């Protein structure tokens, strides 16, 4: 499948795996119809994938600016600059 079809299938799986209201007996009949009904191990892997997938008016709104970012010919990022 192409990239847009794979993204749409991933969005459909994310919408049908998390918003199914914890229903596992009825979600397999739709996932097997959308995938082609290979085996139960694919549905068991998809269930685990769905489980692992999911200046204001305040005076203090502006945080106090305490002196920091210590300046120094030392490269904190630790990368030899080459401009």
């Amino acid at each position: 499948q192409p990239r847009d079809i794979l993204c749409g299938a991933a969005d459909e799986v994310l919408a049908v795996l998390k918003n199914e209201k914890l229903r596992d007996k009825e979600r397999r009949k739709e996932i097997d119809l959308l995938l082609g009904q290979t085996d139960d191990t694919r549905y068991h892997v998809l269930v685990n994938l769905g489980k692992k997938i999911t200046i204001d008016e305040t005076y203090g709104v502006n945080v106090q600016f305490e002196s920091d970012e210590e300046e120094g010919d030392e490269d904190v990022y630790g990368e030899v600059r080459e401009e």
């Binding site: 300046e71 010919d73 030392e74 490269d75 630790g78 990368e79 030899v80 600059r81 080459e82 401009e83």
Partner: protein, 56 residues
């Protein structure tokens, strides 16, 4: 050689594996990764100025 190798690394020099060459070289290789280098690169021929500092 390290800079030539890291040019193709799509990033700046490692500056960590180069620590094997720390505190070496007549030029400031230990300071080759210093922050003020861009500021220091503008100065040219400071040796004569440092010498004439005796008159300064």
């Amino acid at each position: 050689l390290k800079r030539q190798e890291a040019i193709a690394q799509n990033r700046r020099l490692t500056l960590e594996d180069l620590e094997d060459s720390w505190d070496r070289g007549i030029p400031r290789i230990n300071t080759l990764f210093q922050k003020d280098r861009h500021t220091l690169a503008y100065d040219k021929g400071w040796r004569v100025r440092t010498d004439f500092k005796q008159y300064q």
